[PDB]
Amino acid sequence: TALVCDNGSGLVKAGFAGDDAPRAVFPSIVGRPRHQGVMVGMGQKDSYVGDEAQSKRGILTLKYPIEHGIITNWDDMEKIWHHTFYNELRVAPEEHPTLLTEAPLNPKANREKMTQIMFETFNVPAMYVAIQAVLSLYASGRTTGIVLDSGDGVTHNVPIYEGYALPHAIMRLDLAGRDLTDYLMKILTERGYSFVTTAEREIVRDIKEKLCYVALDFENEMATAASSSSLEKSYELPDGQVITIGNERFRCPETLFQPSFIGMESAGIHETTYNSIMKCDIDIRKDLYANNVMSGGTTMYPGIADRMQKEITALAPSTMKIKIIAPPERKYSVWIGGSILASLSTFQQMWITKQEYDEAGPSIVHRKC
Amino acid sequence: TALVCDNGSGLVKAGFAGDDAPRAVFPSIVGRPRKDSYVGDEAQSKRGILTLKYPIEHGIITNWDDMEKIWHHTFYNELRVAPEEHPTLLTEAPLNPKANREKMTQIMFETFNVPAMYVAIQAVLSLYASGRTTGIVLDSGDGVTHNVPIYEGYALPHAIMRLDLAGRDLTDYLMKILTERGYSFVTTAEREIVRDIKEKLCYVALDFENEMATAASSSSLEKSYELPDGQVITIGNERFRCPETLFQPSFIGMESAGIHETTYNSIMKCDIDIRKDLYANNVMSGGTTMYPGIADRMQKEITALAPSTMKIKIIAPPERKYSVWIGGSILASLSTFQQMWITKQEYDEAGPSIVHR
Amino acid sequence: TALVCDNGSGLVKAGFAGDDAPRAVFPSIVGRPRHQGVMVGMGQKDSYVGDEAQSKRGILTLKYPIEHGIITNWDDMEKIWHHTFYNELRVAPEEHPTLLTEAPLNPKANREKMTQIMFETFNVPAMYVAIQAVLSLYASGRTTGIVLDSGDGVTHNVPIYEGYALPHAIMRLDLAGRDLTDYLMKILTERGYSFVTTAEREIVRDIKEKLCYVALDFENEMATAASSSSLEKSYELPDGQVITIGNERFRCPETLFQPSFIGMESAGIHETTYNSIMKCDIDIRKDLYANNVMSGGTTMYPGIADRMQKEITALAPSTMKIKIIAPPERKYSVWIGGSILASLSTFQQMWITKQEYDEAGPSIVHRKC
Amino acid sequence: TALVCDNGSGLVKAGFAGDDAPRAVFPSIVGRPRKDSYVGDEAQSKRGILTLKYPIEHGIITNWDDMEKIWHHTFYNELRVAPEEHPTLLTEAPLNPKANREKMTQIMFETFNVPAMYVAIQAVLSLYASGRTTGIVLDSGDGVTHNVPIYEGYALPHAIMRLDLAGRDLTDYLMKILTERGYSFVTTAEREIVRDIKEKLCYVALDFENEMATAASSSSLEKSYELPDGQVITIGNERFRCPETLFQPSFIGMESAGIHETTYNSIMKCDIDIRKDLYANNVMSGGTTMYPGIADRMQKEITALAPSTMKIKIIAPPERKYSVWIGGSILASLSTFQQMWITKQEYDEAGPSIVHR
Numbered sequence A, C: 001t002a003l004v005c006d007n008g009s010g011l012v013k014a015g016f017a018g019d020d021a022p023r024a025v026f027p028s029i030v031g032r033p034r035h036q037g038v039m040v041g042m043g044q045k046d047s048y049v050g051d052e053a054q055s056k057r058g059i060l061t062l063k064y065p066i067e068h069g070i071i072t073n074w075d076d077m078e079k080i081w082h083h084t085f086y087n088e089l090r091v092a093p094e095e096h097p098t099l100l101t102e103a104p105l106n107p108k109a110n111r112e113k114m115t116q117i118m119f120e121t122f123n124v125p126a127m128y129v130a131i132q133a134v135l136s137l138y139a140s141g142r143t144t145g146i147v148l149d150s151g152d153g154v155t156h157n158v159p160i161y162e163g164y165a166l167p168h169a170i171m172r173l174d175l176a177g178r179d180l181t182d183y184l185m186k187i188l189t190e191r192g193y194s195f196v197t198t199a200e201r202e203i204v205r206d207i208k209e210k211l212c213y214v215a216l217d218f219e220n221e222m223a224t225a226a227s228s229s230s231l232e233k234s235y236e237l238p239d240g241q242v243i244t245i246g247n248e249r250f251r252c253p254e255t256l257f258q259p260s261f262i263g264m265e266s267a268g269i270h271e272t273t274y275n276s277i278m279k280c281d282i283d284i285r286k287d288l289y290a291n292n293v294m295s296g297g298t299t300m301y302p303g304i305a306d307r308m309q310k311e312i313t314a315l316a317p318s319t320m321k322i323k324i325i326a327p328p329e330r331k332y333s334v335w336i337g338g339s340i341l342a343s344l345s346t347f348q349q350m351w352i353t354k355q356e357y358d359e360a361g362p363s364i365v366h367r368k369c
Numbered sequence B, D: 001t002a003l004v005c006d007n008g009s010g011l012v013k014a015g016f017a018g019d020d021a022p023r024a025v026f027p028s029i030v031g032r033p034r035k036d037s038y039v040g041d042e043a044q045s046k047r048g049i050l051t052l053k054y055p056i057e058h059g060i061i062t063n064w065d066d067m068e069k070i071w072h073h074t075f076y077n078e079l080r081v082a083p084e085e086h087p088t089l090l091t092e093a094p095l096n097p098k099a100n101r102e103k104m105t106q107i108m109f110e111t112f113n114v115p116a117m118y119v120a121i122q123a124v125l126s127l128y129a130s131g132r133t134t135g136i137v138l139d140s141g142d143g144v145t146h147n148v149p150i151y152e153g154y155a156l157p158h159a160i161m162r163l164d165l166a167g168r169d170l171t172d173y174l175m176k177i178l179t180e181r182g183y184s185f186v187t188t189a190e191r192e193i194v195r196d197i198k199e200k201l202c203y204v205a206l207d208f209e210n211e212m213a214t215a216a217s218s219s220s221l222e223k224s225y226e227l228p229d230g231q232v233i234t235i236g237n238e239r240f241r242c243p244e245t246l247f248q249p250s251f252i253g254m255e256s257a258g259i260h261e262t263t264y265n266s267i268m269k270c271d272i273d274i275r276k277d278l279y280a281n282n283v284m285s286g287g288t289t290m291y292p293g294i295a296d297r298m299q300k301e302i303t304a305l306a307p308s309t310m311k312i313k314i315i316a317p318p319e320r321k322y323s324v325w326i327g328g329s330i331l332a333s334l335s336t337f338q339q340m341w342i343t344k345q346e347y348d349e350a351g352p353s354i355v356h357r
Ligand SMILES: Nc1ncnc2c1ncn2[C@@H]1O[C@H](COP(=O)(O)OP(=O)(O)O)[C@@H](O)[C@H]1O
Pocket: A007, A008, A009, A010, A011, A012, A150, A151, A152, A153, A177, A178, A205, A208, A209, A210, A296, A297, A298, A300, A301, A331, A332
């Protein structure tokens, strides 16, 4: 079969084409010890990749090799791919073609270097690089719609009509889940809790998933929060301490709709989606309005579907119908579409073979993909 | 085999790798006239004409001329063992200067010419003896009381505590509270009796206020001890008040916090992700922690400090007095450690800097 | 003397009739603070207009009041007109009339609202609105020709023969310098440079004017860039960082000749020029061929005149001779023509007096101007 | 005249506007018995019978019962002035919650009944002292360290950094490295002696590596300090190791980067059109930035991280220990500021929300 690896900014999802769920889902971090070793002959590792780092994170400096959807550390990225191909999938990469994903509007050297590593280090026989937003449309089983893919470093919109993509209407916002974690780390010190280290960033990310939510009306909710203590929630720290947050629950996800909280000048995701639709042709805006697909993990906040529907409804004309498609499996929608695409007879002639790479070099990926 | 020696503040242990107990342990003291030099139990006698000083006091050497005398005594006179024929494993102290370890490597490689050398932290060896990997070691000896937290074999030097209350000050404090009973123990010949009476009839009470009331209302807690000259004395509340100084250092006028507060402070200075594993592994070391009920007392004290959800376990092995030497004997016998010995050739090629491992 | 004002989409040019150069030229932006003031007193204002907004653009949200030759915000436009009359020209509009310009095929409310403001807010004694393309012919001293005024929001062609304008052959293209700046903004992301805020858009605009140029043959130039790095130029940002672009230099201006780069169905400027000539009478097509008066800021790219000459020649019969008239001062040809027109004794009857407006309302801009 | 307050993490400075130095400077410590409470140096004198806890230890009040005692101790005892006649100007740390600044207005107008007041940011007042409106302020103090970028009077709260390493942590590290030489600095009385050693003998080396080699090979860097008991102690390389924790926070087990990289990171998080002006205006303030050579060291470190074409200028006025108070003293006396006092009449007609005016 063919591997379908979705190397995101926050998580790595590997598996085999033709399945329905990823086989390996682990954080994309590499940790190194920051203290000195004292015990004798313990076999203490100098680098931890994946779930090993998350279990020993109290004595490590966790670092993401991918930031904002761009691979900045290439020595660390080869370690993560080695962990995926050997310690997680337990396969020989020389026998399976690999399908990779990449966010739109990325540097041309980010995609070229992936081709060089896959073809010269792991010696795969074929490969292909796909766009994450296109793959999210395969999972939903539709050919017309606009995909809002919010992950850990990139929030991009891609409008597709009858299988045709419009590159001029593609947006890309660099506000995503990691920026929400950092913002929540800052608004927590107002209550007294100080989270600083990279290890404690993972703790705050845990608080964000369990408690944070999106309010339908931000102004009304803020008045309710201060009026009574009916919104406070208690979270227990790993060391037994109990912290309480009352209004930081809905202020952190509000950065998506009000990017001025983190000092950004760009508009919210609700306005960015409307802008992308208006850039398309007038005769295709009606179908794009009713087909709003959301993928990625950052689109999993409770109430984000109801909030997004209400905001776009005000901007759009009253005659038009607005529908937001939020499947419960939208976290793994990019991978599922990759498995569907890689399991198609027509796609079998679109792989980049080793022979083509041996004549045109790593620059063939732009012409083919 | 190898030679395992413990550089204790008051007692120096010696032996071979493989034994279940040190062969020769002596209260190492140096003596100089005020017959050229005296060291060990011999220097205890005729001490009036000798200069008795503590070399290792506060767990740091501070005197290299006296230190070489102790090592000379513990090999030629205590074991009848030639140092140049067998490797020697020494024990360092937590938070020790690199130059302090630097000189220790040079001294035996030149004066004694030992074939192989290795030095280990005393708190680490106490953790090795229990066979554990993660835990905070309360090493209470004769001069110092350390709190060394270790996680996955990675010590945290910024969270290592240090206290100056130990067994030596407990014995001296016992004298200051035994004079009001009519007994006079100024003379050093009677110091050993006070130390002996401390190791026999001293226990730590769970509730200090309740124990004080019991010892006064009724004579049930009173016990009798016979002095060597033939006189029998009875000690009342002194049985538990003297060990209470560890938890209440203000008894001897000190300002520092007790061992229960010192342990909690060291835990809170560690990373939040490793505090849970340190709560469940509280290892004991040294002979100052052989007071009955000390393990039960500190479990209650730390519990009131730690969060209610956290689980507290106090590990107090019955051989905690010799834990450091036992851990050294176990470590020197493992095949993994066999390749970590610092050979003489490595020292010659590089210098004293090899020991920085 | 009578004031002449050239209200452009990106630049404002003002001066007096009779002079040869505009008195004061400044960007047409109105920036407002987005951060929080913390210092006591200070010269902090509510809105900065013109150069004072370009100098403080780091902490302001720049907003162009005119887009695509249409005034969107009618309150920020009054600020710019007030800035021009009182702060830049330092004259009282009460004492002399003003000459205004407008793009062809514009909304009828654009002319009416401009007339109402001048006669009431500033109470000018008279006013007149002149077509920019007509004025550009005055500066060249010609009565027959076809103009290619390419500004910042609108590109248009107006054929004139012996002082007679042909309304049916008048063209208008909504592709201009601002769209080229946005296109260059997107294609700089392929090298890793991310410009997002409105302040950083001005930085990109400076790169376009200093580095971008027009290639004689697009296919030949593309191969040269890949063959060797003999077309790379470095640019120093205000931060001090050095950026390098070698292939984007001749691709951004190519959007004018190939509008499909930004996803548009319209033809290129060379094809639009040919279409305008064809719709005119056959007898006068010979004169228009050799009188291609090129003007506007966007037409200042090096080699654009040669490229237009080669393109039109291929479409035109070999017998006809194609001549491109590109004066070195074409950046202000619209203003210079207005200076010449307002200095004519025959033009004094064409002014719209205040008495006429009071008895006819703001609609008088159509019956005479 | 109007009073000026400089509420700090470890030292408060009060006085009157128009002067050149604070009239009264005392520590911000309130201690309860372990005669209701003791504030300032009086609590430090009776430390043995009081629990010394700081309301501010990290810039934020977080204790509103102790500051009704510290403010009371300042006006009624330190300055000997009834607060109900002069308006007071209090300062607050950057990134302060809107509720914290709202609570000061509530306390002042009711508990103290001051005739109008004002709350200003500490970083802003440090810029007023140097007569600037554009720059980035490194306000290193006793409990926290901030990097506050200001451009033409408009702050950038999204780029304000915060480091919890300050002078208090440097004194503790100096205490630890002094034990390696055998000096026993344990009690809080000896901490004040250690504080005086740091303030008179510790400096910042231009480069750490070459100074280490020079110190280890010569005694020219050694300096002798005379203890209050007449003892003479000597410090060698420890002089430039205590302040080096500012640039290498890993010395005390902290993960964050030094003050040189924190400032550069703060600059790079601002708009690209304002970074050139922030590079040339680096204003230092606070007590901890008084080390000899910190300004020269900071310029060298930021220069490497910045592009070559840029120009870096560190602006350290000689009296930067009281820059925050001096800025408040200058600001209150100006006739322009006389119109922006938060008059008590406003606080009566409306709520305490007018503190955001
Ligand atoms: N239930 C949830 N609520 C809020 N955020 C979530 C939730 N689940 C995941 N996330 C966020 O999604 C991010 C990664 O999700 P995902 O899109 O699956 O990976 P990637 O971003 O690598 O594509 C994480 O950083 C996490 O903060």
